[PDB]
PDB file of C-alpha atoms and ligand atoms in Angstrom:
ATOM      1  CA  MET A   1      37.539 -67.402  67.718  1.00 57.70           C
ATOM      2  CA  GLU A   2      39.672 -70.443  67.451  1.00 60.50           C
ATOM      3  CA  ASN A   3      41.045 -68.918  64.390  1.00 60.77           C
ATOM      4  CA  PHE A   4      42.615 -66.056  66.152  1.00 59.43           C
ATOM      5  CA  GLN A   5      46.053 -65.878  67.875  1.00 58.38           C
ATOM      6  CA  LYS A   6      46.440 -63.280  70.726  1.00 54.09           C
ATOM      7  CA  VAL A   7      49.660 -60.959  70.220  1.00 54.45           C
ATOM      8  CA  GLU A   8      48.980 -58.674  73.127  1.00 56.18           C
ATOM      9  CA  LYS A   9      46.104 -56.471  74.688  1.00 59.79           C
ATOM     10  CA  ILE A  10      45.531 -53.205  73.147  1.00 55.33           C
ATOM     11  CA  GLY A  11      43.549 -51.688  75.661  1.00 55.45           C
ATOM     12  CA  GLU A  12      39.607 -51.203  76.993  1.00 58.19           C
ATOM     13  CA  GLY A  13      37.577 -50.037  74.472  1.00 58.59           C
ATOM     14  CA  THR A  14      34.022 -48.789  74.469  1.00 57.22           C
ATOM     15  CA  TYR A  15      32.087 -52.241  75.189  1.00 58.33           C
ATOM     16  CA  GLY A  16      34.960 -54.477  75.779  1.00 52.88           C
ATOM     17  CA  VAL A  17      38.851 -55.265  75.272  1.00 52.55           C
ATOM     18  CA  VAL A  18      40.659 -54.933  72.310  1.00 54.26           C
ATOM     19  CA  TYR A  19      43.612 -57.059  71.322  1.00 53.27           C
ATOM     20  CA  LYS A  20      46.349 -57.177  68.406  1.00 52.82           C
ATOM     21  CA  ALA A  21      45.750 -60.888  67.019  1.00 52.13           C
ATOM     22  CA  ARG A  22      46.698 -62.872  64.297  1.00 55.66           C
ATOM     23  CA  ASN A  23      44.478 -64.768  61.965  1.00 51.90           C
ATOM     24  CA  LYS A  24      45.735 -68.748  61.840  1.00 53.78           C
ATOM     25  CA  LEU A  25      44.898 -69.638  58.423  1.00 54.53           C
ATOM     26  CA  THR A  26      45.726 -66.237  56.519  1.00 58.31           C
ATOM     27  CA  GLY A  27      48.254 -64.708  58.467  1.00 56.78           C
ATOM     28  CA  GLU A  28      46.038 -61.415  58.789  1.00 57.96           C
ATOM     29  CA  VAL A  29      47.120 -59.175  61.629  1.00 57.10           C
ATOM     30  CA  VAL A  30      43.798 -57.667  63.063  1.00 57.41           C
ATOM     31  CA  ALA A  31      42.377 -55.713  66.137  1.00 59.53           C
ATOM     32  CA  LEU A  32      39.980 -58.238  67.729  1.00 60.19           C
ATOM     33  CA  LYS A  33      37.410 -56.768  70.119  1.00 60.53           C
ATOM     34  CA  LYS A  34      35.810 -58.876  72.502  1.00 62.23           C
ATOM     35  CA  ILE A  35      32.389 -57.578  73.590  1.00 65.11           C
ATOM     36  CA  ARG A  36      31.343 -59.400  76.862  1.00 66.27           C
ATOM     37  CA  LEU A  37      27.778 -59.235  77.393  1.00 69.26           C
ATOM     38  CA  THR A  38      18.755 -55.773  67.759  1.00 67.98           C
ATOM     39  CA  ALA A  39      22.294 -54.755  68.622  1.00 68.39           C
ATOM     40  CA  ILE A  40      23.393 -57.705  66.020  1.00 66.47           C
ATOM     41  CA  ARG A  41      21.351 -56.030  63.309  1.00 64.43           C
ATOM     42  CA  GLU A  42      22.879 -52.558  64.456  1.00 62.82           C
ATOM     43  CA  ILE A  43      26.419 -54.227  63.759  1.00 64.33           C
ATOM     44  CA  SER A  44      25.547 -55.816  60.867  1.00 69.20           C
ATOM     45  CA  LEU A  45      24.704 -51.947  59.538  1.00 69.32           C
ATOM     46  CA  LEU A  46      28.140 -50.572  61.051  1.00 68.07           C
ATOM     47  CA  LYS A  47      29.793 -53.265  58.611  1.00 71.82           C
ATOM     48  CA  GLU A  48      28.521 -51.399  55.506  1.00 71.18           C
ATOM     49  CA  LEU A  49      29.655 -47.994  56.784  1.00 73.56           C
ATOM     50  CA  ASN A  50      32.932 -48.157  54.707  1.00 72.89           C
ATOM     51  CA  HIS A  51      35.193 -45.045  54.270  1.00 72.01           C
ATOM     52  CA  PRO A  52      39.031 -44.296  54.168  1.00 74.16           C
ATOM     53  CA  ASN A  53      38.750 -42.684  57.255  1.00 76.90           C
ATOM     54  CA  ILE A  54      36.804 -44.939  59.403  1.00 76.11           C
ATOM     55  CA  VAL A  55      38.657 -47.973  60.651  1.00 73.27           C
ATOM     56  CA  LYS A  56      37.320 -51.306  58.555  1.00 72.70           C
ATOM     57  CA  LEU A  57      35.116 -53.852  60.276  1.00 71.18           C
ATOM     58  CA  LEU A  58      36.326 -57.000  58.678  1.00 68.50           C
ATOM     59  CA  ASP A  59      34.068 -59.443  60.258  1.00 67.28           C
ATOM     60  CA  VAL A  60      31.445 -60.403  62.932  1.00 69.59           C
ATOM     61  CA  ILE A  61      31.474 -63.340  64.837  1.00 67.76           C
ATOM     62  CA  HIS A  62      28.284 -64.131  66.557  1.00 66.72           C
ATOM     63  CA  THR A  63      29.043 -67.344  68.673  1.00 68.21           C
ATOM     64  CA  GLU A  64      27.614 -67.975  71.860  1.00 68.09           C
ATOM     65  CA  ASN A  65      27.238 -65.573  74.700  1.00 70.02           C
ATOM     66  CA  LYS A  66      29.938 -63.894  72.938  1.00 70.75           C
ATOM     67  CA  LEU A  67      30.522 -61.316  70.311  1.00 71.16           C
ATOM     68  CA  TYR A  68      33.755 -60.915  68.636  1.00 70.31           C
ATOM     69  CA  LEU A  69      34.586 -58.146  66.365  1.00 69.26           C
ATOM     70  CA  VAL A  70      37.605 -58.512  63.748  1.00 68.30           C
ATOM     71  CA  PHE A  71      38.911 -54.667  62.720  1.00 72.31           C
ATOM     72  CA  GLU A  72      41.487 -53.740  60.662  1.00 69.17           C
ATOM     73  CA  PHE A  73      44.481 -53.159  62.772  1.00 71.42           C
ATOM     74  CA  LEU A  74      46.377 -49.532  62.913  1.00 71.91           C
ATOM     75  CA  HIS A  75      50.043 -49.119  64.677  1.00 75.46           C
ATOM     76  CA  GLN A  76      49.669 -46.198  66.473  1.00 74.47           C
ATOM     77  CA  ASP A  77      46.775 -43.760  68.326  1.00 74.28           C
ATOM     78  CA  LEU A  78      47.032 -39.917  68.218  1.00 73.25           C
ATOM     79  CA  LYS A  79      47.229 -39.407  71.811  1.00 70.40           C
ATOM     80  CA  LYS A  80      50.685 -41.407  71.712  1.00 68.72           C
ATOM     81  CA  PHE A  81      51.782 -39.523  68.688  1.00 68.15           C
ATOM     82  CA  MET A  82      50.703 -36.227  70.200  1.00 68.48           C
ATOM     83  CA  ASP A  83      52.940 -37.465  73.266  1.00 68.87           C
ATOM     84  CA  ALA A  84      55.850 -38.440  71.294  1.00 69.46           C
ATOM     85  CA  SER A  85      55.444 -34.885  69.645  1.00 70.67           C
ATOM     86  CA  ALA A  86      55.163 -32.604  72.463  1.00 70.99           C
ATOM     87  CA  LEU A  87      58.684 -31.253  72.341  1.00 67.91           C
ATOM     88  CA  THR A  88      58.235 -29.537  69.325  1.00 66.88           C
ATOM     89  CA  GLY A  89      54.691 -30.083  68.438  1.00 68.02           C
ATOM     90  CA  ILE A  90      52.761 -31.642  65.553  1.00 69.38           C
ATOM     91  CA  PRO A  91      53.739 -29.642  62.320  1.00 71.15           C
ATOM     92  CA  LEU A  92      50.878 -27.503  61.442  1.00 73.97           C
ATOM     93  CA  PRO A  93      50.411 -29.065  57.986  1.00 72.53           C
ATOM     94  CA  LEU A  94      50.238 -32.602  59.728  1.00 73.46           C
ATOM     95  CA  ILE A  95      47.416 -31.217  62.240  1.00 71.74           C
ATOM     96  CA  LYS A  96      45.601 -29.536  59.068  1.00 70.75           C
ATOM     97  CA  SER A  97      45.808 -32.796  57.219  1.00 70.79           C
ATOM     98  CA  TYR A  98      44.541 -34.902  60.282  1.00 70.35           C
ATOM     99  CA  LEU A  99      41.668 -32.358  61.079  1.00 70.40           C
ATOM    100  CA  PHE A 100      40.697 -32.303  57.176  1.00 69.97           C
ATOM    101  CA  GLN A 101      40.595 -36.237  57.145  1.00 69.90           C
ATOM    102  CA  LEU A 102      38.486 -36.692  60.214  1.00 69.57           C
ATOM    103  CA  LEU A 103      36.039 -34.154  59.202  1.00 69.25           C
ATOM    104  CA  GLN A 104      35.608 -36.241  55.832  1.00 66.57           C
ATOM    105  CA  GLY A 105      35.305 -39.420  57.865  1.00 66.84           C
ATOM    106  CA  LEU A 106      32.588 -37.299  60.252  1.00 66.48           C
ATOM    107  CA  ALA A 107      30.862 -36.133  57.030  1.00 64.72           C
ATOM    108  CA  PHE A 108      30.325 -39.557  55.727  1.00 65.96           C
ATOM    109  CA  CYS A 109      29.000 -40.662  59.320  1.00 67.89           C
ATOM    110  CA  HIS A 110      26.898 -37.990  59.684  1.00 63.55           C
ATOM    111  CA  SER A 111      25.298 -38.174  56.051  1.00 64.80           C
ATOM    112  CA  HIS A 112      24.332 -41.791  57.224  1.00 69.00           C
ATOM    113  CA  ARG A 113      22.920 -40.456  60.737  1.00 70.04           C
ATOM    114  CA  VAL A 114      25.852 -42.030  62.235  1.00 68.38           C
ATOM    115  CA  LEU A 115      27.369 -40.339  65.371  1.00 66.22           C
ATOM    116  CA  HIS A 116      31.028 -41.368  67.183  1.00 68.57           C
ATOM    117  CA  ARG A 117      29.512 -39.999  70.547  1.00 70.09           C
ATOM    118  CA  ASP A 118      32.966 -40.215  72.372  1.00 71.39           C
ATOM    119  CA  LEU A 119      35.887 -38.716  70.085  1.00 75.35           C
ATOM    120  CA  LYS A 120      39.371 -38.492  71.626  1.00 75.80           C
ATOM    121  CA  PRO A 121      42.896 -38.660  70.592  1.00 75.98           C
ATOM    122  CA  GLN A 122      42.808 -42.353  72.183  1.00 74.08           C
ATOM    123  CA  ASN A 123      40.361 -43.784  69.501  1.00 76.55           C
ATOM    124  CA  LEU A 124      42.114 -42.188  66.696  1.00 76.17           C
ATOM    125  CA  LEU A 125      44.256 -44.097  64.734  1.00 76.56           C
ATOM    126  CA  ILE A 126      47.168 -43.377  62.513  1.00 81.14           C
ATOM    127  CA  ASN A 127      49.758 -45.316  60.039  1.00 84.72           C
ATOM    128  CA  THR A 128      52.746 -44.484  58.263  1.00 83.27           C
ATOM    129  CA  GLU A 129      50.919 -43.530  55.050  1.00 83.70           C
ATOM    130  CA  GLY A 130      49.717 -40.159  56.506  1.00 84.71           C
ATOM    131  CA  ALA A 131      46.239 -41.357  57.186  1.00 83.61           C
ATOM    132  CA  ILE A 132      44.281 -40.990  60.353  1.00 80.33           C
ATOM    133  CA  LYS A 133      40.981 -43.016  60.940  1.00 80.75           C
ATOM    134  CA  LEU A 134      38.004 -42.731  63.541  1.00 80.31           C
ATOM    135  CA  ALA A 135      37.777 -46.110  65.579  1.00 83.82           C
ATOM    136  CA  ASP A 136      35.933 -47.351  68.537  1.00 86.36           C
ATOM    137  CA  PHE A 137      32.490 -46.141  67.725  1.00 85.26           C
ATOM    138  CA  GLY A 138      28.929 -47.436  66.515  1.00 82.86           C
ATOM    139  CA  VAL A 139      35.650 -41.792  81.999  1.00 83.54           C
ATOM    140  CA  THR A 140      37.073 -38.992  80.114  1.00 83.48           C
ATOM    141  CA  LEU A 141      35.168 -36.140  79.942  1.00 79.45           C
ATOM    142  CA  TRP A 142      37.731 -33.803  78.361  1.00 75.87           C
ATOM    143  CA  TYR A 143      36.224 -33.814  74.956  1.00 73.41           C
ATOM    144  CA  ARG A 144      32.102 -33.938  75.960  1.00 73.87           C
ATOM    145  CA  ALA A 145      29.801 -31.242  74.503  1.00 76.20           C
ATOM    146  CA  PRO A 146      28.376 -28.987  76.942  1.00 78.88           C
ATOM    147  CA  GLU A 147      24.656 -30.137  75.542  1.00 75.20           C
ATOM    148  CA  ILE A 148      25.488 -33.968  76.787  1.00 75.11           C
ATOM    149  CA  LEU A 149      26.719 -32.183  80.032  1.00 74.40           C
ATOM    150  CA  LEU A 150      23.686 -30.337  80.735  1.00 74.10           C
ATOM    151  CA  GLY A 151      21.666 -33.569  80.195  1.00 70.51           C
ATOM    152  CA  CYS A 152      20.529 -33.518  76.677  1.00 65.88           C
ATOM    153  CA  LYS A 153      18.810 -36.835  75.843  1.00 69.01           C
ATOM    154  CA  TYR A 154      18.687 -36.636  72.223  1.00 71.80           C
ATOM    155  CA  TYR A 155      21.692 -34.963  70.841  1.00 75.31           C
ATOM    156  CA  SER A 156      22.971 -34.542  67.344  1.00 73.61           C
ATOM    157  CA  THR A 157      25.946 -34.795  64.978  1.00 73.94           C
ATOM    158  CA  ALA A 158      27.216 -31.526  66.527  1.00 74.99           C
ATOM    159  CA  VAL A 159      28.490 -33.287  69.732  1.00 74.91           C
ATOM    160  CA  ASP A 160      31.186 -35.156  67.354  1.00 76.85           C
ATOM    161  CA  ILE A 161      32.460 -31.493  65.822  1.00 77.28           C
ATOM    162  CA  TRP A 162      32.615 -30.133  69.497  1.00 75.85           C
ATOM    163  CA  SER A 163      35.000 -33.141  70.447  1.00 75.81           C
ATOM    164  CA  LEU A 164      37.100 -32.765  67.190  1.00 74.65           C
ATOM    165  CA  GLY A 165      37.481 -28.914  68.008  1.00 74.91           C
ATOM    166  CA  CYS A 166      38.978 -30.069  71.679  1.00 75.22           C
ATOM    167  CA  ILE A 167      41.281 -32.305  69.827  1.00 73.88           C
ATOM    168  CA  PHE A 168      42.090 -29.506  67.105  1.00 73.92           C
ATOM    169  CA  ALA A 169      42.911 -26.965  69.811  1.00 74.94           C
ATOM    170  CA  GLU A 170      45.075 -29.807  71.605  1.00 70.49           C
ATOM    171  CA  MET A 171      47.111 -30.516  68.779  1.00 70.46           C
ATOM    172  CA  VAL A 172      48.092 -26.778  68.287  1.00 72.09           C
ATOM    173  CA  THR A 173      48.955 -26.023  72.087  1.00 73.16           C
ATOM    174  CA  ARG A 174      49.915 -29.280  73.402  1.00 73.96           C
ATOM    175  CA  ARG A 175      47.694 -28.940  76.265  1.00 78.19           C
ATOM    176  CA  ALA A 176      43.979 -30.271  76.677  1.00 81.46           C
ATOM    177  CA  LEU A 177      41.580 -27.492  76.123  1.00 80.53           C
ATOM    178  CA  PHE A 178      39.318 -28.473  78.909  1.00 80.29           C
ATOM    179  CA  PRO A 179      40.594 -30.997  81.399  1.00 79.29           C
ATOM    180  CA  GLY A 180      37.769 -31.547  83.908  1.00 81.75           C
ATOM    181  CA  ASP A 181      37.740 -34.593  86.219  1.00 86.06           C
ATOM    182  CA  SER A 182      33.982 -34.566  87.028  1.00 86.24           C
ATOM    183  CA  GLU A 183      30.932 -33.369  85.022  1.00 83.76           C
ATOM    184  CA  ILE A 184      30.333 -29.799  86.837  1.00 83.70           C
ATOM    185  CA  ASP A 185      34.163 -29.503  86.742  1.00 82.33           C
ATOM    186  CA  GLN A 186      34.185 -30.077  82.998  1.00 81.27           C
ATOM    187  CA  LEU A 187      31.164 -27.952  82.744  1.00 83.68           C
ATOM    188  CA  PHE A 188      32.791 -25.083  84.461  1.00 83.82           C
ATOM    189  CA  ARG A 189      36.104 -25.210  82.707  1.00 80.65           C
ATOM    190  CA  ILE A 190      34.324 -24.723  79.314  1.00 81.16           C
ATOM    191  CA  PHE A 191      32.204 -21.840  81.041  1.00 76.08           C
ATOM    192  CA  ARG A 192      35.309 -19.960  82.307  1.00 77.68           C
ATOM    193  CA  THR A 193      37.036 -20.231  79.103  1.00 74.39           C
ATOM    194  CA  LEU A 194      33.980 -19.365  76.563  1.00 72.48           C
ATOM    195  CA  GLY A 195      31.823 -17.754  79.101  1.00 72.98           C
ATOM    196  CA  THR A 196      28.681 -19.019  80.948  1.00 71.49           C
ATOM    197  CA  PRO A 197      26.013 -19.655  78.103  1.00 69.34           C
ATOM    198  CA  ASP A 198      22.643 -17.727  78.234  1.00 70.79           C
ATOM    199  CA  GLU A 199      19.635 -17.473  76.227  1.00 70.02           C
ATOM    200  CA  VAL A 200      21.559 -14.912  73.829  1.00 68.88           C
ATOM    201  CA  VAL A 201      24.195 -17.140  72.540  1.00 65.69           C
ATOM    202  CA  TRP A 202      22.340 -20.611  73.087  1.00 67.85           C
ATOM    203  CA  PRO A 203      18.432 -20.074  72.853  1.00 64.75           C
ATOM    204  CA  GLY A 204      16.909 -22.956  74.976  1.00 65.40           C
ATOM    205  CA  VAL A 205      19.744 -23.512  77.479  1.00 67.99           C
ATOM    206  CA  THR A 206      18.028 -22.269  80.512  1.00 70.09           C
ATOM    207  CA  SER A 207      15.375 -24.928  79.913  1.00 71.01           C
ATOM    208  CA  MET A 208      17.685 -27.903  79.630  1.00 71.67           C
ATOM    209  CA  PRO A 209      17.534 -30.970  82.148  1.00 72.79           C
ATOM    210  CA  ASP A 210      20.700 -30.121  84.505  1.00 72.56           C
ATOM    211  CA  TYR A 211      20.961 -26.201  83.870  1.00 72.20           C
ATOM    212  CA  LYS A 212      20.757 -24.633  87.214  1.00 69.92           C
ATOM    213  CA  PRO A 213      19.834 -20.848  87.206  1.00 67.46           C
ATOM    214  CA  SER A 214      22.256 -20.566  90.284  1.00 64.15           C
ATOM    215  CA  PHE A 215      25.434 -21.852  87.707  1.00 65.79           C
ATOM    216  CA  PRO A 216      28.159 -19.038  88.381  1.00 67.75           C
ATOM    217  CA  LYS A 217      28.306 -16.271  85.290  1.00 67.01           C
ATOM    218  CA  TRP A 218      31.874 -16.302  83.790  1.00 66.39           C
ATOM    219  CA  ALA A 219      32.536 -14.051  81.052  1.00 64.97           C
ATOM    220  CA  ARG A 220      33.941 -15.269  77.594  1.00 65.46           C
ATOM    221  CA  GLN A 221      37.855 -15.187  77.406  1.00 64.08           C
ATOM    222  CA  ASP A 222      39.354 -13.712  74.799  1.00 63.65           C
ATOM    223  CA  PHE A 223      40.025 -16.372  71.816  1.00 61.57           C
ATOM    224  CA  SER A 224      43.358 -15.346  70.826  1.00 61.08           C
ATOM    225  CA  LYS A 225      44.460 -16.167  74.516  1.00 56.37           C
ATOM    226  CA  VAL A 226      43.042 -19.661  74.036  1.00 55.06           C
ATOM    227  CA  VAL A 227      45.116 -21.227  71.103  1.00 54.43           C
ATOM    228  CA  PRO A 228      48.149 -19.220  70.485  1.00 56.51           C
ATOM    229  CA  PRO A 229      49.565 -19.487  67.978  1.00 54.02           C
ATOM    230  CA  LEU A 230      46.972 -20.581  65.766  1.00 56.17           C
ATOM    231  CA  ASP A 231      46.415 -18.164  63.083  1.00 58.89           C
ATOM    232  CA  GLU A 232      43.457 -16.287  62.075  1.00 60.52           C
ATOM    233  CA  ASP A 233      41.694 -18.850  59.620  1.00 60.71           C
ATOM    234  CA  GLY A 234      42.378 -21.760  62.035  1.00 58.03           C
ATOM    235  CA  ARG A 235      40.961 -19.964  65.239  1.00 55.94           C
ATOM    236  CA  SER A 236      38.068 -18.859  63.081  1.00 54.84           C
ATOM    237  CA  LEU A 237      37.281 -22.625  62.204  1.00 52.70           C
ATOM    238  CA  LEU A 238      37.718 -23.470  66.076  1.00 52.87           C
ATOM    239  CA  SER A 239      35.442 -20.803  67.055  1.00 52.73           C
ATOM    240  CA  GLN A 240      32.707 -22.208  64.941  1.00 52.86           C
ATOM    241  CA  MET A 241      33.425 -26.072  66.093  1.00 54.77           C
ATOM    242  CA  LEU A 242      33.091 -24.516  69.663  1.00 51.43           C
ATOM    243  CA  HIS A 243      29.794 -22.884  69.320  1.00 51.33           C
ATOM    244  CA  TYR A 244      27.628 -23.461  72.230  1.00 54.51           C
ATOM    245  CA  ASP A 245      24.250 -23.827  70.598  1.00 53.70           C
ATOM    246  CA  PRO A 246      24.646 -27.326  68.618  1.00 55.18           C
ATOM    247  CA  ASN A 247      22.465 -25.917  65.792  1.00 53.83           C
ATOM    248  CA  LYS A 248      24.865 -23.019  64.918  1.00 54.27           C
ATOM    249  CA  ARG A 249      27.775 -25.088  65.523  1.00 53.74           C
ATOM    250  CA  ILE A 250      29.493 -25.704  62.209  1.00 52.71           C
ATOM    251  CA  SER A 251      28.974 -29.134  60.097  1.00 51.67           C
ATOM    252  CA  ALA A 252      31.597 -31.550  59.150  1.00 51.11           C
ATOM    253  CA  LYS A 253      30.626 -30.796  55.528  1.00 52.13           C
ATOM    254  CA  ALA A 254      30.736 -27.007  55.987  1.00 53.25           C
ATOM    255  CA  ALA A 255      33.897 -26.909  57.694  1.00 50.64           C
ATOM    256  CA  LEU A 256      35.686 -28.647  54.937  1.00 50.79           C
ATOM    257  CA  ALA A 257      35.014 -25.647  52.702  1.00 51.87           C
ATOM    258  CA  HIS A 258      36.217 -23.277  55.404  1.00 51.72           C
ATOM    259  CA  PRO A 259      39.095 -21.003  54.139  1.00 49.21           C
ATOM    260  CA  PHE A 260      41.657 -22.833  56.779  1.00 50.21           C
ATOM    261  CA  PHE A 261      41.843 -25.692  54.610  1.00 49.88           C
ATOM    262  CA  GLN A 262      42.900 -23.678  51.218  1.00 53.73           C
ATOM    263  CA  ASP A 263      46.451 -24.969  51.572  1.00 56.30           C
ATOM    264  CA  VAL A 264      45.523 -28.643  52.889  1.00 56.98           C
ATOM    265  CA  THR A 265      48.241 -30.909  51.788  1.00 57.60           C
ATOM    266  CA  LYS A 266      48.695 -34.584  53.079  1.00 60.66           C
ATOM    267  CA  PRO A 267      52.328 -34.905  54.930  1.00 58.60           C
ATOM    268  CA  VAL A 268      53.656 -38.230  56.065  1.00 58.97           C
ATOM    269  CA  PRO A 269      54.242 -38.246  59.814  1.00 56.25           C
ATOM    270  CA  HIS A 270      57.521 -39.586  61.332  1.00 56.97           C
ATOM    271  CA  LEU A 271      56.104 -42.894  63.049  1.00 56.33           C
ATOM    272  CA  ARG A 272      58.253 -44.446  65.528  1.00 55.64           C
ATOM    273  CA  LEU A 273      56.800 -48.116  66.132  1.00 53.49           C
TER     274      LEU A 273
HETATM  275  C1  FMD B 301      45.661 -47.867  72.062  1.00 57.08           C
HETATM  276  O1  FMD B 301      44.696 -47.876  70.519  1.00 57.08           O
HETATM  277  C2  FMD B 301      45.534 -48.525  69.467  1.00 57.08           C
HETATM  278  C3  FMD B 301      46.573 -48.339  69.327  1.00 57.08           C
HETATM  279  C4  FMD B 301      46.860 -49.073  67.739  1.00 57.08           C
HETATM  280  N1  FMD B 301      45.750 -49.319  67.572  1.00 57.08           N
HETATM  281  C5  FMD B 301      44.863 -48.998  68.627  1.00 57.08           C
HETATM  282  C6  FMD B 301      43.222 -49.653  68.483  1.00 57.08           C
HETATM  283  C7  FMD B 301      42.618 -49.921  67.107  1.00 57.08           C
HETATM  284  C8  FMD B 301      43.086 -50.651  66.084  1.00 57.08           C
HETATM  285  O2  FMD B 301      44.423 -50.696  65.581  1.00 57.08           O
HETATM  286  N2  FMD B 301      42.209 -51.180  65.486  1.00 57.08           N
HETATM  287  C9  FMD B 301      40.823 -50.976  66.238  1.00 57.08           C
HETATM  288  C10 FMD B 301      39.680 -51.051  65.905  1.00 57.08           C
HETATM  289  C11 FMD B 301      38.694 -50.960  66.582  1.00 57.08           C
HETATM  290  C12 FMD B 301      38.727 -50.226  67.773  1.00 57.08           C
HETATM  291  F1  FMD B 301      37.823 -49.973  68.796  1.00 57.08           F
HETATM  292  C13 FMD B 301      40.060 -49.836  68.051  1.00 57.08           C
HETATM  293  C14 FMD B 301      40.289 -49.243  69.410  1.00 57.08           C
HETATM  294  C15 FMD B 301      40.715 -48.530  70.535  1.00 57.08           C
HETATM  295  C16 FMD B 301      40.890 -47.874  71.553  1.00 57.08           C
HETATM  296  O3  FMD B 301      39.955 -46.853  71.862  1.00 57.08           O
HETATM  297  C17 FMD B 301      41.203 -48.680  73.103  1.00 57.08           C
HETATM  298  N3  FMD B 301      41.752 -49.913  72.658  1.00 57.08           N
HETATM  299  C18 FMD B 301      42.458 -48.070  73.907  1.00 57.08           C
HETATM  300  C19 FMD B 301      42.436 -46.634  73.351  1.00 57.08           C
HETATM  301  O4  FMD B 301      42.226 -48.348  75.264  1.00 57.08           O
HETATM  302  C20 FMD B 301      41.145 -49.977  67.352  1.00 57.08           C
END
């Protein structure tokens, strides 16, 4: 750990603080996650999870009551980019590219039974090359899947698809889709837009740990009202990413074959660093 010089604090990650740091021998600029404290075996496996759309775990340093994770560094997160793009909005071709690449990263994760669990614009990283990467995996509730909010203990890869749908919508409209500030408010914001789920659209839902028969019964809103000005292909894909039933929610693999991605390209973003 004495091999690393702090450049600056990036922020709080899931299990500790992330810093931009430099390796004193090589000169490598990295993102160093300091975890404060079988997990060692779990992380060892994460090091093998290599993909162009996953931030590279370079090294794991287990020294003391201390665990440091040395990751690849990227210059910007998607939230910052969205914020900087808020006057014009991110161009649709760039939205489409970012969505497509994230679905590739997730299809890869998911094929290895690895879930992200906490996808949000603040943990999606971009570079000048036009790439976007999944990071900070292996409180904001805005992106949480409804099965989690309803107390599912053993949730599935479908949770990441839900989160990515919310992010997709947000890139298009320049507004957070479901900006809740408590679990119930989050849940009720979802219910008010998509309709209160019942046994018809989500078999099993009334059986969930925190489902209450006494939940208000709201009607589904018209979907063309939710994400203007997204085209029919985009709205169709989004609706499949936001299905209530986790088992009917589209997989990352199937989403990549959606007609929305017929004309996908890889634009370069204009980043001010
Ligand atoms: C604000 O986040 C930025 C901006 C540039 N890079 C990052 C983050 C990481 C980077 O470059 N490599 C990484 C490897 C594992 C990582 F977990 C990260 C990360 C992250 C973030 O979720 C938190 N540090 C923030 C949101 O508070 C990063």
